[PDB]
Structure formats: C-alpha cells, structure tokens
Design a protein around this ligand. Structure first.
Ligand SMILES: [Cl-]
Ligand SMILES: [Cl-]
Ligand SMILES: [Cl-]
Ligand SMILES: [Cl-]
Ligand SMILES: [Cl-]
Ligand SMILES: [Cl-]
Ligand SMILES: [Cl-]
Ligand SMILES: [Cl-]
Lengths: 279, 279
C-alpha cells in the first residue's frame, strides 16, 4: 500500500540524557480524490506513554511537506528498552477525526545508538493511534483588529471522560486569557449535568489591543463539577503564542480572517503536559 | 496585469514608537518560473532606508502562501512622512535571479494610523527593487551527520562594490563559525586582486557534532584587501540559527540532503544590519 515516505533523524544525546527526534520531511503522500491535496503534520511520541505528544506545524495544500523540525524526549539511556518511537502523519481539517495518512514506528531495540540515524522509510497503514481518551472540545475564535476584541465561543464537547462513579460527568468549561505566564482574565461556562457530550454555545469576549494579540494565549479547560468535593479537570488545550500544530493553525486562521468566527475541534490533553508547554 | 493578491496589516504602536507590518498571505500568484508553481517569499522594507530588509520564510511549491509573519520598524511617529512601505513578493531560486513576482507600495501619507489597517491589495509589476548594491557571494554547504563535519566551499562572487579609487577591488572572503554569539572558528580565503568577480572555489571544514549543528551560525563576509590601511568589508550574509528567507532555505536544504553539497548565491547585505540580526 502506497502511503508515501518520511525522512527522520534519531540520536541519543548522552550529554543531556535525552532522545533527539528530527522530522525532516515527507514525500509522495497519497493524493486525495475528495480534496486534491492534504494539510499534513506529524505527531511524535514514545510508547507506552501516549500522554506526551508533539506536533509539527501544519503544512498547507501539499503532498511533499518539508518540516525541518526537532523534538526532545528526556529519557535515561537505561530506560530506553521497551519504548517505541511513533511518527504519525495526520491530515488536518477542523474536525475531531484523526485522519492518519500513514505512520512509522521505531522500536528502540532496532536502533543503533552511538551513531546518528537519518533516513527515509515508507509510511505504514494505521487507523487508530495510541491515544489517551479525554474527549474533544469545540470552540470558535474571532478577532477584530481595529476594535481589539477577541471573542471565544465555547460550542460543545464530546466523548468526555467519565468523572462520576456509576455515571457520566457534570462538565463545564473555563477560559484563561494569559500573557507571558500571567493570568489576565477568567471566564466560566454554565454547568451541564450527567453527560459526556455537553452543548454550550456560550460566547465570551476579551479586550486585547492589536499590539498584544500576538503575545497572548487562550487556555481552554474542561472540568467536572462536583458539589461535595474537588472539581477535577478532565483535560485542556491552548492556542496562541507558542501553540503548535492544530492549535497554532486555529489561531493563525483567526488572524488571517479578521471579523470572522473560525470554529474548530480540538483533542483534549492531560492537564499536566499542557501546563509544561505553557511553562 | 494579473499578478495575485497580498494580505497585510499595518499599525503604528505609539507605545513603543515602532511601525508594525504584518505579512499574512498572498493568493493567486501567477503560475510561473520553476514549473507548476513557485517558492514565494516576501521582502519587507521601509524606503528610503533601502539598506535594511526583512524576509519571510520561503514557502515551497505554492501560489497561495500563508505566512502569518510580523515585522517591526522603529521609527518616530514624527519621522514617518517621506517613508514608503515596500512589500515585494520574490520567487526563490539558487541562482542570482532576484526575480520579483509582484509588489505593493504603501506611502505613509496614504495611511490612516490610529486604526489598524488590514487588507488585500493586488500586486503590481516591478522588475528591479530598490537595492543597495554590494554584490553577490556564492558558496556551498555540506553536512555529514554521523561524522559531524560541516563543509563550506566559497565558490565565487560577482558585481562586488568598488573599494579601490580609480580601480576595482582586491576581494577576499572569511568565514566565522559561531554559536550563541560566541566565535568558535575562523577561516580566510586567498586574496584575488583587481576584480569585482573573483573566483575562489576554496573549501573549509569544521567539526560540529550532530547535537550542535542546530545551534551554530556560519557568517560569510567579503572584504577588500588593502596593504597600506584598513581592510573594509564590502558586505556579509549568514546562515543557520535565526537566519531567515533565502539564507534559512540554504541551511535547511543542507540539512535535508545529508552528504550532499548544496550551492547557492546570496545577496550581500551591509555589515551593520546583519550584525544586528546576529545580536
Ligand atoms: Cl505537492
Ligand atoms: Cl512544505
Ligand atoms: Cl532539519
Ligand atoms: Cl461538528
Ligand atoms: Cl525496545
Ligand atoms: Cl522502508
Ligand atoms: Cl503555505
Ligand atoms: Cl498572522
């Protein structure tokens, strides 16, 4: 099955005890018949912990993307056995999908370290990818340059994780406007009870002058409401400064289409790893 | 004449007394040079400076590039009159074609500040672009990941500026391997006398382990030899970390084609402005 090639680099840096993964480029990706081209990007992670995933920038309308991106996994050399590098090429669109054009796995036991690995390898078929299920959140972003008004509409969520024993969840979403690690504003949606697919369609606005929009970050977190007890977050995602892949594309599209609300689905990630990226 | 559209943003930031220029995207670029498409990028400068230009990343094989890039010009509001913003869309080539697809000028006197300008405007015809003439330098880059060997071959130069009264120049080139503002190595070619188009074809090597190649910078400077007196640089250019446009493409191509020498012509820039970018 012809799915194209991926050029990558692999190297263990004994100095800083970290694995270096390079996503150079992909070639000959399958040509769509329902679209024409693809908006490819690569997710990079190490099994068995599909918690931490990295993403390349999403490339527009192409079957031969050149990424030139580097990623890092802090792992002690003596803990490499049992781990597998996964490089999945996704086809972007504003949906929850997970359209895996193809992928390439590299079991650490097949790698000759102490020498730099850099090569092309054919992409293999794959429908589902090892993923931690927390659900998807859907929201729209709209920015009016002149007025300096940022509008975030929390539309809906689906397949949320079950936070209530012998039940579902009581999901609510809160937004955090941030700038340089500093919390500028907070917002919270109403609470929906007993559901994994809440529908909100609640709009919120912020005042972000054009001279700042380029430095802020909008953090969206979905949590479960618990009357008697702590409200545990089920997952989060953020867009704006330093965001990557799909999140960066969402933010960019917003800036490219002033005055228009761009809606898009995002895959929720574990609160801990998203916080490290906002760090 | 159909040359495509450019979407840009313009705004004066009275807070930091600087002009903000945004190059969002271009559409319908004419299907020309290099076959089916082009490798577009935009040079941005404020006339009558002409000496300081900025460049967007070069986008591969496309007639509808989305840049999402921001640039800054520190200019006092009271010194804006008499200045013109120039946004020229070039088509990338490894030769010294300096081919302009189209351009769009914005005289400051036509801008209504105190309000964000963001729009599309058709590109206009243009052959030559206001340029400070210093000449072009041609060199090749080759990198061997495993061996950690970086090879720079100074091939030749052309149209060098005349540094000798009632004569031409006595050009020589020196290379600076840098890392984090720190000078790691130096190299110098032989000296060619009385010429504006010297031919060198001199090769040099550096030891840059794979775990560092991603952080170094190769600075190439062309100077005029003067026996009795100071050797004045005619111009320079650099590639690697933080390099942009054509320079970044050269560096990337090197990394994408290990073990192969990638040759390319570069337009020399004034020593002062290049140093500010290496700052
Ligand atoms: Cl293509
Ligand atoms: Cl690309
Ligand atoms: Cl690279
Ligand atoms: Cl939907
Ligand atoms: Cl293994
Ligand atoms: Cl293969
Ligand atoms: Cl593009
Ligand atoms: Cl933008």
């Amino acid at each position: 099955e012809k799915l194209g090639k991926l050029q990558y680099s692999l190297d263990y840096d004994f100095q800083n005890n970290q694995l270096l993964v390079g996503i150079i480029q992909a070639a000959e990706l399958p040509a769509l018949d329902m679209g024409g081209t693809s908006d490819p990007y690569v997710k990079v992670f190490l099994l068995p912990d599909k918690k931490k995933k990295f993403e390349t920038k999403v490339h527009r309308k192409t079957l031969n993307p050149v990424f030139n991106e580097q990623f890092t996994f802090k792992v002690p050399y003596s803990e490499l056995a049992g781990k597998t590098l996964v490089m999945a090429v996704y086809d972007f669109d504003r949906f929850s999908k997970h359209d895996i054009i193809g992928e390439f796995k590299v079991p650490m036991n097949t790698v000759d370290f102490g020498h730099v690995t850099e090569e092309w390898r054919d992409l293999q078929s794959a429908e589902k990818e090892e993923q931690e299920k927390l659900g998807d959140i859907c929201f729209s972003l709209r920015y009016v340059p002149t007025a300096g008004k940022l509008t975030v509409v929390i539309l809906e969520a689906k397949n949320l994780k079950k936070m209530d024993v012998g039940g579902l969840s009581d999901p609510y979403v809160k937004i955090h406007l941030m700038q340089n690690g500093k919390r500028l504003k907070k917002k919270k949606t109403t609470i929906k009870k007993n559901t994994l697919n809440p529908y909100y369609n609640e709009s919120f606005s912020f005042e972000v002058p054009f001279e700042q929009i380029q430095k802020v970050q909008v953090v969206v977190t979905v949590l479960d409401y618990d009357k008697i007890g702590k409200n545990d977050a089920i997952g989060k995602v953020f867009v704006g400064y330093n965001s990557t892949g799909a999140e960066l594309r969402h933010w960019s599209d917003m800036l490219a289409n002033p005055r228009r609300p761009i809606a898009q689905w995002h895959t929720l990630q574990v609160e801990e790893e998203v916080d490290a990226m906002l760090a």
